[PDB]
Amino acid sequence: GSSGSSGRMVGIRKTAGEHLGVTFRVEGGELVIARILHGGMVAQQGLLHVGDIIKEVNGQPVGSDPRALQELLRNASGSVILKILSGPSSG
Template sequence: MLFCQGVTFRIENGELVIARILHGGMIDQQGLLHVGDIIKEVNGREVGDDPRVLQEMLQETSGSVVLKILPRSRLSLSLQVFVKCHFDYDPADDNLIPCKEAGLKVSSGDILQIVNQEDVNWWQVGRST
């Protein structure tokens, strides 16, 4: 998997698939890409199955970017899930987190909202308001 500007990709059946989108990031706020979407082309050039090629294509681009995607099915339930923290956590102290800026510092007793649990190994949360 490769993390790029708030999006993580995986290769599935020889295609580049969006595996995760960082909640609250630019891609999430735009709402145009979704987990499961397949990236086919950037500005008319085929991407293939290498996330590094996609990253290079985007870096070389100036001006507008036109993506050709194969969207996943958009059927989903909008279920709100909340959890209560039972311990303190600081991503700055976590040696296993690949992107400390994406981590959320929490204290025991905090109430968090699960905003994305599509990946069984990596849930995204936000503070409950």
């Protein structure tokens, strides 16, 4: 009925070490999934897709460091949350 949630909390069933397989880019000041590799987590899920904008993760700032983010997940075992948001991403 009454929707009370911002962005979009995406739940991942990844395991310690398990990598995602994606590339984020910094344009304008936001982390956007530059590209997504097939045969992986994101791909399979089908949820995330090029253009996805990340703001916060499990209550932590992703910052403008995409190379550091892809590493944060690598060490994220259990139900991980990702707050995504839309934008100018053409499509």
